Amino acid sequence: NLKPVDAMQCFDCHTQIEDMHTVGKHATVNCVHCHDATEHVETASSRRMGERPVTRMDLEACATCHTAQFNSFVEVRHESHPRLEKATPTSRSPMFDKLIAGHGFAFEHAEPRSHAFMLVDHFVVDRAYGGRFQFKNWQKVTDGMGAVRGAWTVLTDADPESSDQRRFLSQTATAANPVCLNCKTQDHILDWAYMGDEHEAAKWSRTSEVVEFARDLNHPLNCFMCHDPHSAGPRVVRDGLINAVVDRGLGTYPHDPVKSEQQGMTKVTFQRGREDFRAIGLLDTADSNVMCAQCHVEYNCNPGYQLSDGSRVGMDDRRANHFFWANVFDYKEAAQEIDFFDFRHATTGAALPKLQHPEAETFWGSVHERNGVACADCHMPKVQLENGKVYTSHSQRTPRDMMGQACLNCHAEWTEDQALYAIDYIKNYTHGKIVKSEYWLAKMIDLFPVAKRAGVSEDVLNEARELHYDAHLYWEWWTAENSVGFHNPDQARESLMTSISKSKEAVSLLNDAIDAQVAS
Amino acid sequence: NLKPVDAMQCFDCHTQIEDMHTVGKHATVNCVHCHDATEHVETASSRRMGERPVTRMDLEACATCHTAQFNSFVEVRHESHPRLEKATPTSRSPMFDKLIAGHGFAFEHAEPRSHAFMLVDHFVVDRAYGGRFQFKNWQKVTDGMGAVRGAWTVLTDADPESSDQRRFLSQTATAANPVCLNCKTQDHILDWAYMGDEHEAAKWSRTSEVVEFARDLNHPLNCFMCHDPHSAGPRVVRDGLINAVVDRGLGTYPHDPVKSEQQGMTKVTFQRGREDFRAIGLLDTADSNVMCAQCHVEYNCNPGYQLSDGSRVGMDDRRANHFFWANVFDYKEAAQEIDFFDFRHATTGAALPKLQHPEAETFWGSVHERNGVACADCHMPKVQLENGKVYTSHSQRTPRDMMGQACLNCHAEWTEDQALYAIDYIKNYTHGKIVKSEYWLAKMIDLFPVAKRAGVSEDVLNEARELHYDAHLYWEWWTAENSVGFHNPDQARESLMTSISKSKEAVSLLNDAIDAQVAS
Amino acid sequence: NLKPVDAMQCFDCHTQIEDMHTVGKHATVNCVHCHDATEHVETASSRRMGERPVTRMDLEACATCHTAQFN
Amino acid sequence: GVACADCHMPKVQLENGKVYTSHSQRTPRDMMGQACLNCHAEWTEDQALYAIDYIKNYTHGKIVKSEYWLAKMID
Numbered sequence A, B: 001n002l003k004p005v006d007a008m009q010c011f012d013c014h015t016q017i018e019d020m021h022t023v024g025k026h027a028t029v030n031c032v033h034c035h036d037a038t039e040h041v042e043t044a045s046s047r048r049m050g051e052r053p054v055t056r057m058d059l060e061a062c063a064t065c066h067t068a069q070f071n072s073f074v075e076v077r078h079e080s081h082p083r084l085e086k087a088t089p090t091s092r093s094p095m096f097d098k099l100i101a102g103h104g105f106a107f108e109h110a111e112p113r114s115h116a117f118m119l120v121d122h123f124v125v126d127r128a129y130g131g132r133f134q135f136k137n138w139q140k141v142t143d144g145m146g147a148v149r150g151a152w153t154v155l156t157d158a159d160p161e162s163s164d165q166r167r168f169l170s171q172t173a174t175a176a177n178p179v180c181l182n183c184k185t186q187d188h189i190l191d192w193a194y195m196g197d198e199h200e201a202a203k204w205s206r207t208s209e210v211v212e213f214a215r216d217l218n219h220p221l222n223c224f225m226c227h228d229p230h231s232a233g234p235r236v237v238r239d240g241l242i243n244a245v246v247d248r249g250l251g252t253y254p255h256d257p258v259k260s261e262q263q264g265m266t267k268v269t270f271q272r273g274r275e276d277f278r279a280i281g282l283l284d285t286a287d288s289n290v291m292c293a294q295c296h297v298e299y300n301c302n303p304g305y306q307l308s309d310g311s312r313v314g315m316d317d318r319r320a321n322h323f324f325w326a327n328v329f330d331y332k333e334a335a336q337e338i339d340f341f342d343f344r345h346a347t348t349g350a351a352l353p354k355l356q357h358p359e360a361e362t363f364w365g366s367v368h369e370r371n372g373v374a375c376a377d378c379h380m381p382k383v384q385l386e387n388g389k390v391y392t393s394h395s396q397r398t399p400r401d402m403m404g405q406a407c408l409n410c411h412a413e414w415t416e417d418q419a420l421y422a423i424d425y426i427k428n429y430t431h432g433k434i435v436k437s438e439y440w441l442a443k444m445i446d447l448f449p450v451a452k453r454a455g456v457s458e459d460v461l462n463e464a465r466e467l468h469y470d471a472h473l474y475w476e477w478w479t480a481e482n483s484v485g486f487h488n489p490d491q492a493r494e495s496l497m498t499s500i501s502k503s504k505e506a507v508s509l510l511n512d513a514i515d516a517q518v519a520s
Numbered sequence C: 001n002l003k004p005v006d007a008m009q010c011f012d013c014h015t016q017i018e019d020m021h022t023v024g025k026h027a028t029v030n031c032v033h034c035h036d037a038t039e040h041v042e043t044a045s046s047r048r049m050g051e052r053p054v055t056r057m058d059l060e061a062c063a064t065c066h067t068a069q070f071n
Numbered sequence D: 001g002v003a004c005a006d007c008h009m010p011k012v013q014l015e016n017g018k019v020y021t022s023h024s025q026r027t028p029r030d031m032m033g034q035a036c037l038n039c040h041a042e043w044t045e046d047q048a049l050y051a052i053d054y055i056k057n058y059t060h061g062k063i064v065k066s067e068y069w070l071a072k073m074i075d
């Protein structure tokens, strides 16, 4: 059984913790619930850590007093089909292989599934670690509780004796790097300096051997990613988000200065040896839009190249951990502002961006966002009980599973079937335009080899490559974004029509240039 | 409250109405239910209208005394997925964009949904009005009753101050013209001369500004499209159908003279200033096959070109409002008979037809049609009540929703699952041949640029273009037709195999010609 | 099929019904829906019924225009 | 101001249609959405049924006891 420790002794050296813990709703929660600091207290000074205390990062540290929230979190939605590749005719991007050729995502890009699996899924996807990690067997894919207990309870490593990123199977890639893990776990929260910069107190950084880092990480989506463990108040911990919102002054709602002020973020920095080390962002309100934006954003978390001169941008560069914090129509400017692109298309040679799940940036300016609705209202609502103490569901999932609570309480004019019909109208329309955009991108891409072989000039090919960047951006945003337009239907429509327009311009340019070469 | 008017006063000048009203089952229904004619009666003469009476065209004019039929009509089938683009891998025509390139349908062609939405869907589809009209917001897509009350109660116009057809968004088209509206509404029944010819008494015609016309129209599928309001007897009002059946003498069942005589149509013409103005077709029997054929047919409702010389055929030409009234194997001859084609393929340059929803012509000669079965038996059956007055369901929808009434009463040997299995056998087989036909069409189409660039002769290209017409026709009939072969499975099979044969002939011709150029 | 009768003629002797029928939502509903009064009209005066007209009491007399309520 | 029809012949609720008054005069148990929960938004169907049953059960118990005592007197 746990035995409490004297917090006042800790507070002597930990003023920031005292100021947070004594005021919030964890003022009665003893440190022993999460820390084993006996040897630390014996050896520390006011400025030197001495022996390092043990800090629990397992979600069960919270389950003890918050079982309802933990159990709701760890539930597996079996209807969220697992390991479902998006580059298939029946999923989100039928022509993805042709369009993304040159990028690691060609090796595998599955639809998301329940949060419990995020860290294990990161480890086992074919694009990440060369197939090094696997579930212990194919049965273990069901085990959400086991994944939560720890990745290494359910996974195996093909070669514990080496730590290099390499292929273990032919059709894999080694795209993973340390930055990725910030959106899968925060087990490393005390071992990683802000932004993953090099730091004498950091075990891990952007430039670490990712296989070694991986082995040190266990738990998905720690509860403390959204809730300060000391004050119990709302927060974010993701460095890239704090950097966008606070350091770069863009605000929590870049398009709305007032809402940004009302629903803001305060950066709190913790030091090691009186040098800034790590930071958190305390939220003015329990604003799920910003909490979920720790991960459900478009980002850089990878090496790339400069738009200006084509030179390599490696993991050592700050740009390798970056939140663009820009909607689809501001993205090109945001990529220009850091002089960055992700890859060269394998067929066209165009410099292209790689877009990833920009739900937060897409939601900005939508009718729901403008009306004060937030992700949690649709994806983790309060639970309705005939007789019971209400709590917030932590099963982050489609509203289709809880339409009473997610939609119909605010849309009293609709039945469940009507609300579902409205969702489907948007998704069906948007998906149709995604497919049309892919058709036209594919048509353009297929002309590049024909044009090169016909002797079309590099000047013309480069004009087409410039169009490819835009045709790509204004399409891929929407295969990346998980709502199939629901989050911002008018924006999706405008963007996808722009993609098609750009591809059609490139097709005409290339066809005319090929025909002129042939005629000559 | 309504106050009756003296019908005998009207009958003094309206002999045709007297002859219909006094004999049928509306003999006791006073004119005030549908007409406000006070000032008209004061000012008319036997030959001049004077002040124009108001005529109600809203469906609620009938709902008052026929609520069951109205409510069944306006029901929305939420399982009929809305705004679902057909040019996607999971819908009816995976390769539609490549095959239809050059035609407006490339901008958008969705699956049908419930009848309540026909007029609003016509107004808002991306191919029709350049994106000028939209629902007031994305919520309104659910509102079938509102659509029925009137399109302009649920839609907005991007520019009320102009009336030209233009693009408001990039990836739209302006294919709509006045003829289209005849299959969406008959609000214009008193304002449109037969066939849309120019007429001094007609406000609207084939050559009208369609945006202005659109603004004057409100209600979908008026109840009086199938039921004469004066006699209550069965009829059609669609000019193009009357023209095919009566003027051109083709009959209600062109393949069956006897059934045509037993189940015929009598053209009744109404005059303005003692000049023929409009017409209806009174049916000998309540024959849903002919009622539904007002709209569920292949038609011209658009400009096009002549097969003979390639010249433009505009909206002013009668051929712009035409029912071919021909099955798939008689269609080419029917298009030749009016010297007409719809578009030139964007890649192949072939003159091609555009086929649209030919359910009526497909049903001819099928086993069910030959056995006296009609559309209503499967799509709007009598309602079965343990205790109640029977009425006819007006919810025109798939029999899957009412298999007891639609199929199993006539197929006592089957369970519901067996009947569904039989439908699926046909649809699955037919769809497979549609996909194969598209594969071969696509293969042929892709050879055209290769052949042109290799220097293949125009003579060879023109031979391939002639094959393209047939390959196209014998495929597109079946993506246009909504039953996926169920209405006439053997015909679908024969046609689709013909399509593949034609495409294979073209592929061989082009490949051999390319190879010969290369060899030279 | 029903053939309407001249309600104004009935009202020459039926002021009580006139005052109800002409004001309410059945003002357009002809008497033939519920009465067979041909021989009555031929034989009545304002003070003598003559032949008794038939009045329908069956619910189907209403179902004809109000099927939803009937069913 | 509630009347028999509110519980026993309510207006029909239609996603798309012309409203009319149900003439099926029957227990509200068959149409609880339209003939109780429309007024009692604080309740689920099961809660509303439970409240009916509490009353009927209590009342019936007193009917049975009343009959017991009447019968004892009669005898």
Ligand code: HEC
Pocket (backbone or CB within 6 Å): A005, A006, A007, A009, A010, A011, A012, A013, A014, A031, A035, A037, A038, A040, A041, A044, A045, A046, A047, A048, A049, A052, A053, A055, A190, A271, A272, A273, A274
């Ligand atoms: C003699 C002063 C002193 C006392 C007493 C003390 N600490 Fe610390 N502690 C430090 C210093 C110094 C650091 C390094 C960070 C800093 O400079 O604030 C540290 C770091 C930590 C960390 C971060 C460890 C890591 O992995 O980065 C935790 C957790 C912690 N202390 C918990 C506690 C707890 C719980 C108590 C009471 C049981 C306690 N400390 C008492 C001085 C103290």
Ligand code: HEC
Pocket (backbone or CB within 6 Å): A025, A026, A029, A030, A033, A061, A062, A063, A064, A065, A066, A223, A224, A227, A229, A231, A232, A233
């Ligand atoms: C020893 C029991 C205990 C432990 C362990 C514990 N909590 Fe709490 N927590 C509480 C109590 C007590 C409250 C206050 C309840 C109230 O008054 O509403 C609370 C409140 C909260 C609140 C609501 C705060 C607010 O201001 O509304 C959050 C969020 C929370 N805890 C999260 C967590 C997280 C995350 C963990 C794991 C890092 C955790 N708790 C661990 C007991 C515990």
Ligand code: HEC
Pocket (backbone or CB within 6 Å): A137, A138, A139
């Ligand atoms: C009568 C025994 C038996 C039956 C029947 C059976 N399983 Fe298994 N299954 C096993 C055993 C034993 C293993 C291997 C256990 C281990 O090594 O951990 C296994 C392994 C598996 C695996 C892992 C496969 C792999 O390659 O790693 C899956 C998935 C699985 N079973 C699913 C199913 C499914 C689904 C069914 C029903 C279609 C089924 N099993 C029926 C006994 C059975």
Ligand code: HEC
Pocket (backbone or CB within 6 Å): A108, A109, A110, A111, A112, A113, A121, A122, A123, A125, A127, A128, A175, A176, A177, A179, A180, A181, A182, A183, A294, A295, A296, A297, A298, A299, A300, A301, A302, A357, A480, A482
């Ligand atoms: C800014 C936070 C963020 C970063 C950094 C991040 N991800 Fe993710 N990842 C997500 C979110 C959100 C999802 C779920 C939504 C989705 O997949 O579209 C996800 C899903 C996944 C999945 C499951 C779906 C799939 O694509 O197969 C895998 C595997 C994955 N990430 C791997 C990685 C890898 C490898 C990296 C680093 C190269 C990485 N992630 C970096 C946020 C992030």
Ligand code: HEC
Pocket (backbone or CB within 6 Å): A059, A062, A063, A066, A069, A070, A071, A073, A221, A222, A223, A224, A225, A226, A227, A286, A287, A288, A291, A292, A376, A390, A391, A392, A393, A394
């Ligand atoms: C992605 C951010 C996020 C994560 C991670 C998270 N929560 Fe929450 N949590 C929320 C939100 C949002 C609320 C509701 C705040 C509101 O509306 O006031 C909430 C509320 C709570 C509350 C307050 C009582 C309630 O139910 O409303 C507790 C306790 C809590 N969470 C515990 C946990 C536990 C334990 C975990 C880990 C199993 C967890 N949270 C993980 C977002 C998160």
Ligand code: HEC
Pocket (backbone or CB within 6 Å): A080, A288, A289, A292, A293, A296, A359, A360, A363, A368, A373, A374, A375, A376, A377, A378, A379, A397, A398, A399, A400, A423, A427, A482, A483, A486, A487
């Ligand atoms: C007004 C309600 C609403 C809001 C607010 C909302 N979403 Fe969604 N979201 C939806 C709907 C509807 C879908 C489509 C779900 C479906 O079709 O099953 C969706 C889909 C998703 C999906 C994919 C779910 C799946 O299983 O396919 C993710 C991830 C997501 N949203 C994240 C977010 C984020 C993060 C936010 C806050 C920035 C957000 N959503 C805000 C309604 C909402």
Ligand code: HEC
Pocket (backbone or CB within 6 Å): A367, A368, A371, A373, A377, A378, A399, A406, A407, A408, A410, A411, A419, A420, A422, A423, A489, A490, B137, B138, B139
């Ligand atoms: C707590 C409020 C709230 C919630 C939760 C909510 N809605 Fe809404 N929704 C609104 C409001 C307010 C509007 C805008 C109303 C208006 O302007 O007419 C709106 C707009 C919409 C629109 C129109 C969008 C557009 O771009 O025109 C759709 C569709 C919709 N909601 C569906 C849903 C669905 C489905 C859900 C459940 C996933 C949901 N809403 C949840 C309040 C809500």
Ligand code: HEC
Pocket (backbone or CB within 6 Å): B005, B006, B007, B009, B010, B011, B012, B013, B014, B031, B035, B037, B038, B040, B041, B044, B045, B046, B047, B048, B049, B052, B053, B055, B190, B271, B272, B273, B274
């Ligand atoms: C003095 C003769 C006269 C009388 C009486 C008369 N009409 Fe007409 N009405 C006409 C003429 C003439 C036209 C033009 C068409 C025609 O020539 O038949 C016309 C046209 C109409 C139209 C078509 C209007 C349009 O928009 O095209 C309607 C409806 C109509 N009458 C209804 C009635 C009704 C109902 C009454 C009795 C209340 C009535 N009329 C009495 C002469 C008459």
Ligand code: HEC
Pocket (backbone or CB within 6 Å): B025, B026, B029, B030, B033, B061, B062, B063, B064, B065, B066, B223, B224, B227, B229, B231, B232, B233, C064, C065
């Ligand atoms: C004032 C009430 C009233 C109005 C308004 C009305 N009807 Fe009727 N309708 C009747 C009556 C009464 C009958 C005869 C019922 C019977 O005897 O079977 C009838 C019969 C019919 C029939 C059956 C005819 C047959 O020969 O079998 C049809 C079809 C019909 N109406 C359609 C309509 C249409 C369409 C409208 C709107 C243009 C309409 N009705 C408006 C009262 C009305």
Ligand code: HEC
Pocket (backbone or CB within 6 Å): B108, B109, B110, B111, B112, B113, B121, B122, B123, B125, B127, B128, B175, B176, B177, B179, B180, B181, B182, B183, B294, B295, B296, B297, B298, B299, B300, B301, B302, B357, B480, B482
């Ligand atoms: C001969 C009658 C007829 C004509 C004329 C007609 N349609 Fe249709 N329309 C139909 C039928 C029947 C359907 C439903 C069956 C289907 O879509 O296959 C339909 C469906 C539609 C739809 C919904 C499905 C889709 O394609 O997205 C739209 C939009 C539409 N029509 C627009 C038009 C336009 C624009 C015109 C004129 C260029 C037109 N229609 C002319 C009969 C017609």
Ligand code: HEC
Pocket (backbone or CB within 6 Å): B059, B062, B063, B066, B069, B070, B071, B073, B221, B222, B223, B224, B225, B226, B227, B286, B287, B288, B291, B292, B376, B390, B391, B392, B393, B394
């Ligand atoms: C597409 C043609 C069509 C349309 C439009 C149409 N009906 Fe019908 N209607 C039919 C058919 C078919 C029958 C059954 C005839 C038969 O089998 O005798 C029917 C029968 C009827 C009947 C006779 C009683 C019955 O139910 O059998 C009435 C009354 C009627 N319809 C009213 C209406 C009303 C009111 C509307 C507008 C809401 C409407 N109809 C629209 C085709 C149509």
Ligand code: HEC
Pocket (backbone or CB within 6 Å): B080, B288, B289, B292, B293, B296, B359, B360, B363, B368, B373, B374, B375, B376, B377, B378, B379, B397, B398, B399, B400, B423, B427, B482, B483, B486, B487
């Ligand atoms: C013997 C029964 C039968 C007859 C008669 C019939 N159909 Fe069909 N129809 C079907 C079946 C079965 C389907 C496929 C429905 C499905 O798979 O859900 C279908 C599909 C349709 C569809 C598409 C429905 C949808 O939701 O996909 C339309 C439109 C249609 N038929 C119109 C007609 C027309 C118009 C007629 C008269 C010329 C007609 N049908 C006659 C059985 C019939």
Ligand code: HEC
Pocket (backbone or CB within 6 Å): D002, D003, D004, D005, D006, D007, D008, D026, D027, D028, D029, D052, D056
């Ligand atoms: C506030 C709603 C309400 C009102 C108003 C109401 N009732 Fe009831 N009535 C009920 C309930 C509840 C029952 C018990 C039904 C059950 O248990 O299934 C009932 C039972 C009945 C029953 C027996 C039903 C059966 O199937 O056992 C009759 C008869 C009845 N009521 C008549 C009337 C009359 C007549 C009025 C108007 C003077 C009236 N009720 C007003 C709620 C109502």
Ligand code: HEC
Pocket (backbone or CB within 6 Å): C059, C062, C063, C066, C069, C070, C071, D005, D009, D019, D020, D021, D022, D023
């Ligand atoms: C026991 C009395 C009673 C009887 C008998 C009765 N109704 Fe009603 N009726 C009502 C009530 C109560 C209303 C609703 C009045 C209101 O709330 O405004 C109603 C309304 C109506 C309405 C108006 C439209 C509507 O639905 O609200 C019509 C039409 C009607 N009844 C027809 C009939 C028919 C036909 C019959 C015979 C089958 C019938 N009624 C028998 C009580 C009755």
Ligand SMILES: [Ca+2]
Pocket (backbone or CB within 6 Å): A298, A299, A300, A301, A354, A355, A356
């Ligand atoms: Ca990116």
Ligand SMILES: [Ca+2]
Pocket (backbone or CB within 6 Å): B298, B299, B300, B301, B354, B355, B356
């Ligand atoms: Ca056509």
